């Protein structure tokens, strides 16, 4: 499965001037485009090397698209004040996220579209993609405004057709990058504590996509230290799980790695 | 809610003009359309909350802008003979309103681009008394008014009775007719008839007047010609009662 | 891009009129406007949902399940409806505040003529000269009169008047020139009128 997601953000700036609009495009676990109004150069720019050579029609469309969204979001911000009874003193956030997910077959599986005020669920497009549901008592006016103007129909066409159509295009554009699977480099490192305590770590480094599984056995559930999947900085990801080991008896514990890049799930132990 | 400035405008080829818009209160968007004489309204430019939102094939010689208050202006340079049209202003985008996409128009600016300003002429209004053969055969009245020897289409013919307006039986001509159809920039023409009762105009105390409000040249326009200045003038033709 | 057919409709008062609007793309919102000569376009009906038909008295508009067609019907047609009818729409997938218009459909409402008794009269000038007018009033509905055939003589189209106080309607046309080869009669010649017409002295 592959998905085309977009993360749009607008932040009101009291005294600093016009609000700041920033939108980022994601083909799978890869950021491929971005837009920013803070620059004097306010255009949609390539953030993946496969987008670097695309032509100016595409860059013209996406700039005018993002430009228009920024204009509306600016107004939406002054409007959102009236609802929550706010002043020109506080800096507030307006976030919009949308995306389509393909199936294991190759065609549309699901789609989503959510709006949020100050990082809190505001208005959400229904699962059916036919209408809107307010997740806040102040969104009620914005909802029974959208539902009456058949707004969900515009978003339905993009999510079901456009989003999907273009996603295939981008996946083909960078087959050698996106569709190529990088399996994780795995190693177990030992960091002792005292006479009894000791720490054993399972390092999963250089993997794509970020969806991975790392667990310690004897099924050892009680107090496992696991870190969030962090970006390596080169496009791949990193993750590790640590366990409290009673000194000497190390072979009693086993680490299991599960990722799409591996044909069979790999198990590991520390080499002294 | 939409208000446009000016109403009727007349200049010469090669000059420049500025047209104002005062949109509805709360409406952030402003649109500019060029409805020609029969050639349907064509979009020019749209602004939204001060910034330019969408453009629609503007000649480059046509400028525009929206201010901090949602007011706008349409600038027309090297005014060419072809640009003679009814320019309209539209208003929408009030996040207060629920009907948002709905557009609202103002009564357009009548712009005309001539080559020589000496081709502008005031109207000829003369009042005509009813026919004795009509007030018996039909047993009713009809006072006919005509408008001739004027330029351009800028004219508003009306009728007044005993000091106040009248619309009953009135039949103002809708389209202007070229007096010389085998000529360019021809002096247009119109017609009207005011039908009343047989006894109403037989009373000598009754007043029957035809009026023609014409929109002419500006005050700030130079008139090098020997004759009078063809400016905006209310030209009338009054007729009293006769038994 | 929108297209409204039939561009022009010469109709008779009291009748019903249908107007079509077809697009070259799926639409989401339909807007029906009327524009009077000189006046700015004024909104009649607005459609938001695919199946709904919405009305404003004598005016009814439909969305059309196709999403590329819309209709406009006028029940009783008083000659007040004489105007240009513009169809507008919100193309599906278009950014906010983007709506297309058509060239419009011109509607002509002909008066409901009762007594087709014609006559040409002598309406005398307020100046003791020769510049006078000949008034042709109360003619038929079936006619298709043409403009000034000769140069010095002028003739205008038909116009509908109403005596609201005495609730009686009629028709009219004016003829004027400068020559002695003039005095009504021999005025209206190119246009065809039936054998019975009153000609006084």
């Amino acid at each position: 499965s592959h998905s085309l997601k977009y993360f749009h953000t607008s932040v009101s700036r009291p005294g600093r001037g016009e609000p700041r609009f920033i939108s980022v495009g994601y083909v799978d676990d890869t950021q491929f485009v971005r837009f920013d109004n803070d620059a004097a150069s306010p255009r949609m720019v390539p953030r993946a090397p496969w987008m670097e050579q695309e032509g100016s029609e595409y860059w013209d469309r996406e700039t005018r698209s993002a430009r228009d969204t920024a204009q509306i979001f600016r107004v939406n911000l002054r409007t959102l004040r009236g609802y929550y009874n706010q002043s020109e003193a506080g800096s507030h956030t307006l976030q919009w996220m949308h995306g389509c997910e393909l199936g294991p077959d190759r065609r549309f599986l699901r789609g989503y579209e959510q709006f949020a005020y100050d990082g809190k669920d505001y208005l959400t497009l229904n699962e059916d993609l036919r209408s809107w549901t307010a997740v806040d008592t102040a969104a009620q006016i914005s909802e029974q405004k959208s539902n009456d103007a058949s707004e969900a129909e515009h978003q339905r066409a993009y999510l079901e057709d456009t989003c999907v159509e273009w996603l295939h295009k981008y996946l083909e554009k960078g087959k050698e990058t996106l569709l190529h699977l990088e399996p994780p480099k795995t190693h177990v490192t030992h960091h002792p504590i005292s006479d009894h305590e000791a720490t054993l770590r399972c390092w999963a480094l250089g993997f794509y996509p970020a969806e991975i599984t790392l667990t310690w056995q004897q099924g050892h559930t009680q107090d496992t230290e696991l870190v969030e999947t962090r970006p390596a900085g080169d496009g791949t990801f990193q993750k590790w799980a640590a366990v409290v080991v009673p000194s000497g008896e190390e072979q009693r514990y086993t680490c299991h790695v599960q990722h799409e890049g591996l044909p069979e799930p790999v198990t590991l132990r520390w080499k002294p | 809610g939409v208000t446009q400035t000016p109403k009727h405008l007349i200049t010469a080829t090669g000059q420049r003009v500025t047209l104002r818009c005062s949109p509805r209160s709360g409406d952030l968007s402003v649109y500019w359309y060029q409805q020609s004489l029969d050639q349907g309204l064509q979009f020019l430019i749209q602004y939204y909350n001060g910034e330019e939102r969408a453009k629609g094939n503007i000649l480059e010689r046509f400028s525009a802008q929206q201010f901090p208050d949602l007011h706008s202006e349409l600038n027309l340079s090297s005014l060419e003979l072809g640009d003679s049209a009814l320019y309209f202003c539209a208003s929408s985008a009030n996040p207060g309103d629920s009907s948002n996409e709905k557009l609202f128009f103002g009564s357009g600016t009548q712009l005309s681009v001539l080559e020589d300003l000496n081709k502008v002429f005031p109207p000829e209004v003369a009042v005509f008394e009813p026919s004795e053969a009509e007030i018996s055969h039909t047993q009713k009245a009809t006072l006919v008014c005509l408008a001739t020897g004027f330029y351009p289409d800028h004219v508003e013919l009306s009728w007044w009775v005993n000091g106040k307006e009248v619309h009953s039986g009135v039949c103002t001509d809708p389209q202007p007719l070229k007096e010389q159809p085998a000529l360019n920039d021809s002096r247009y023409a119109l017609s009207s008839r005011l039908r009343v009762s047989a006894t109403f105009w037989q009373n000598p105390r009754n007043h029957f007047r035809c009026q023609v409000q014409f929109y002419g040249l500006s005050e700030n326009d130079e008139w090098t010609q020997d004759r009078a200045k063809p400016v905006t003038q209310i030209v009338s033709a009054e007729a009293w009662g006769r038994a | 891009q929108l297209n409204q057919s039939p561009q022009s409709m010469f109709i008779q008062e009291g009748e019903d009129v249908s107007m079509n609007c077809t697009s070259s793309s799926i639409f989401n919102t339909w807007l029906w406007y009327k524009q009077d000569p000189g006046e700015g376009p004024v909104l009649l009906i607005a459609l938001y949902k695919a199946g709904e038909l919405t009305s404003n008295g004598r005016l009814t508009a439909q969305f059309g399940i196709t999403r590329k067609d819309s209709f406009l019907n006028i029940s009783a047609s008083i000659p007040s409806d004489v105007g240009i009818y513009f169809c507008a729409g919100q193309p599906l997938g278009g950014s906010n505040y983007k709506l297309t218009f058509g060239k419009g459909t011109l509607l002509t409402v002909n008066p409901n003529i009762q007594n087709p008794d014609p006559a040409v009269y002598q309406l005398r000038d307020s100046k003791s000269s020769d510049k006078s007018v000949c008034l042709f009033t109360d003619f038929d509905s079936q006619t298709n009169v043409s403009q000034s055939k000769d140069s010095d003589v002028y003739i205008t189209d038909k116009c509908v008047l109403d005596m609201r106080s005495m609730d009686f309607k009629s028709n009219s046309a004016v003829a004027w020139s400068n020559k002695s080869d003039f005095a009504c009669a021999n005025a209206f010649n190119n246009s065809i009128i039936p054998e019975d017409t009153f000609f006084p002295s």
Partner: peptide
């Protein structure tokens, strides 16, 4: 491509 339209709240 990002959505061509948005919501006027």
């Amino acid at each position: 491509v990002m959505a061509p339209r948005t919501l006027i709240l």
